[PDB]
Design an enzyme around this catalytic site. Structure first.
Site, mmCIF file in Angstrom:
data_model
loop_
_atom_site.group_PDB
_atom_site.id
_atom_site.type_symbol
_atom_site.label_atom_id
_atom_site.label_comp_id
_atom_site.label_asym_id
_atom_site.label_seq_id
_atom_site.Cartn_x
_atom_site.Cartn_y
_atom_site.Cartn_z
ATOM 1 N N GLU A 89 0.691 -1.203 -0.026
ATOM 2 C CA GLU A 89 -0.164 0.006 0.032
ATOM 3 C C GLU A 89 0.946 1.397 -0.009
ATOM 4 O O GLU A 89 0.599 2.359 -0.619
ATOM 5 C CB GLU A 89 -1.327 0.158 0.991
ATOM 6 C CG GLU A 89 -1.688 -1.205 1.231
ATOM 7 C CD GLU A 89 -2.520 -1.321 2.414
ATOM 8 O OE1 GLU A 89 -2.436 -0.339 3.311
ATOM 9 O OE2 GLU A 89 -3.278 -2.494 2.740
ATOM 10 N N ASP A 142 -10.178 2.333 -0.291
ATOM 11 C CA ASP A 142 -8.815 2.981 -0.181
ATOM 12 C C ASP A 142 -8.480 4.329 -0.443
ATOM 13 O O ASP A 142 -8.080 5.295 0.180
ATOM 14 C CB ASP A 142 -7.531 2.121 -0.584
ATOM 15 C CG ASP A 142 -7.435 0.858 0.165
ATOM 16 O OD1 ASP A 142 -7.633 1.121 1.498
ATOM 17 O OD2 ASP A 142 -7.083 -0.068 -0.274
ATOM 18 N N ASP A 146 -9.077 -0.144 -4.162
ATOM 19 C CA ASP A 146 -8.776 -0.618 -2.992
ATOM 20 C C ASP A 146 -7.454 -1.418 -3.454
ATOM 21 O O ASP A 146 -7.301 -1.938 -4.418
ATOM 22 C CB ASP A 146 -9.864 -1.794 -2.450
ATOM 23 C CG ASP A 146 -10.545 -1.134 -1.496
ATOM 24 O OD1 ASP A 146 -10.603 -0.091 -0.901
ATOM 25 O OD2 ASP A 146 -11.538 -2.171 -0.970
ATOM 26 N N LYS A 202 -5.203 -4.605 -3.092
ATOM 27 C CA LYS A 202 -5.242 -6.081 -2.510
ATOM 28 C C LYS A 202 -4.034 -6.772 -2.770
ATOM 29 O O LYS A 202 -3.354 -6.384 -3.562
ATOM 30 C CB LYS A 202 -6.472 -6.758 -2.941
ATOM 31 C CG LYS A 202 -7.784 -6.264 -2.654
ATOM 32 C CD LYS A 202 -7.936 -6.412 -1.250
ATOM 33 C CE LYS A 202 -9.482 -5.922 -0.684
ATOM 34 N NZ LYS A 202 -9.182 -4.832 0.426
#
Lengths: 244, 244
Positions: free
Chosen positions: B44, B73, B89, B91
């Site tokens: 991230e 996110d 998002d 993952k």
């Protein structure tokens, strides 16, 4: 003892969890960036190795979950004695200003505390201790994005998202509180105080027994809460009235 | 376009960076361990800036949850049309063998997807796309918690948690599966396929609407049983039977 050793393990001397960033293979240093998500994970990381050395020292076996969201963080036991197990859950928190009152989340109150085999590594009854290794740090601003790399020579020029790290070891039942935490309300909120009280152990509950009781009878519904008790105070009364 | 620059910037930057540790102000470097827990936070970290640079490129504003348990996110939007938002998002998952089926978790089906405004940064009805940045790393031996400290002159000696990283950008609905997740279980799991199938958007739902309907009418089962539907066939059948 297993306890004292481990305590010395995280304290004073050499521990200084002064992280700067992520290092690359070429050797580029990426800064941590502003975010709790990152910081707690690093703490968990520093922990692993300490925990695996004091345990082995005292012949224990460290066991980590495999399944998702299962208590607890680390399991420690000697095969010959399955009922004398120990539980360790790493907790992380941060204050805005240094020295303010900290507060944690201690996990649920409706799983393994109410059902011996619910969402936990080994049946609840096989554990004798439930310790909490807490990490406290002062957030340093938030800033924003990065993409700025540094080199080994820019180590001190790197911006840290946190300051004054403290850690403590304590029994779960000792620093636990009477209010469910915010966000979930399915999970036990801790006492709300100065780090020192954690370490001192100044709590609310009288014993691990009182802790479990309050928590097992805690009505999961707002109004229903009004029915029994909403806190250590109304809990005492309810007690005096007949547990009804 | 946005989608294009984005995945292109992900290909160039998320290939080269082969991180091996955490470095402190002392110059010590603690290994990482192949745990999804630490690698995902890392992924991230890396993602943040590239997502920003590209959005800014196309005139989009980027927003992050101020709350931690919130989706998505990153919220992207063009002021010129404040009601068409894009959700991204991040993952991450791992693979033990190159070229083998993988899987991911894609959030829960019980909040926003069901009530439009729960745990989501902005009302569900405002997003016109939900993208999923997927990261697949190639897992390596889990020796010991070798948090041994290494110095800058030993980087090549430092054991990496992984050797390989693939990434892709795809539509949520297109890679969604008909079963729940691992431990979280209250989560939507993805299809259980090969990387390429992700990239190629080869899933099971016929369309995005079939995807919401399936996930909205899904029943919570401590155990399957279900007198409704447990998978795509059953669900398809159920529709033809009156959605009793």
């Amino acid at each position: 003892s297993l306890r004292s050793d481990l305590i010395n393990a995280l304290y004073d001397e050499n521990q200084k969890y002064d992280v700067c960033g992520i290092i690359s293979a070429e050797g580029k240093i990426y800064p941590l960036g502003s975010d709790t998500k990152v910081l707690s994970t690093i703490f968990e990381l520093f922990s692993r190795p300490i925990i695996n050395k004091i345990a082995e020292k005292h012949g224990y076996i460290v066991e980590e979950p495999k399944q998702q969201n299962h208590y607890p963080d680390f399991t420690l036991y000697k095969p010959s004695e399955p009922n004398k197990k120990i539980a360790i859950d790493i907790k992380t928190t941060y204050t805005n200003k240094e020295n303010e009152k900290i507060k944690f989340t201690l996990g649920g109150y409706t799983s393994f505390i109410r059902n011996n085999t619910k969402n936990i590594v080994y049946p609840f009854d096989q554990y004798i201790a439930h310790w909490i290794i807490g990490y406290v740090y002062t957030r340093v601003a938030t800033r924003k994005s990065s993409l700025k790399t540094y080199n080994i020579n820019e180590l001190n020029e790197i911006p840290k998202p946190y300051k004054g790290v403290k850690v403590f070891l304590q029994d779960k039942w000792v620093i636990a509180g009477d209010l469910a935490g915010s966000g979930n309300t399915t999970n036990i909120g801790s006492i709300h105080a100065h780090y020192k009280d954690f370490v001192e152990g100044k709590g609310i509950f009288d014993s691990e027994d009182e802790f479990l009781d309050y928590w097992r009878n805690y009505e999961r519904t707002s109004q229903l809460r009004n029915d029994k008790y909403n806190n250590i105070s109304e809990y005492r009364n309810w007690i005096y009235r007949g547990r009804k």
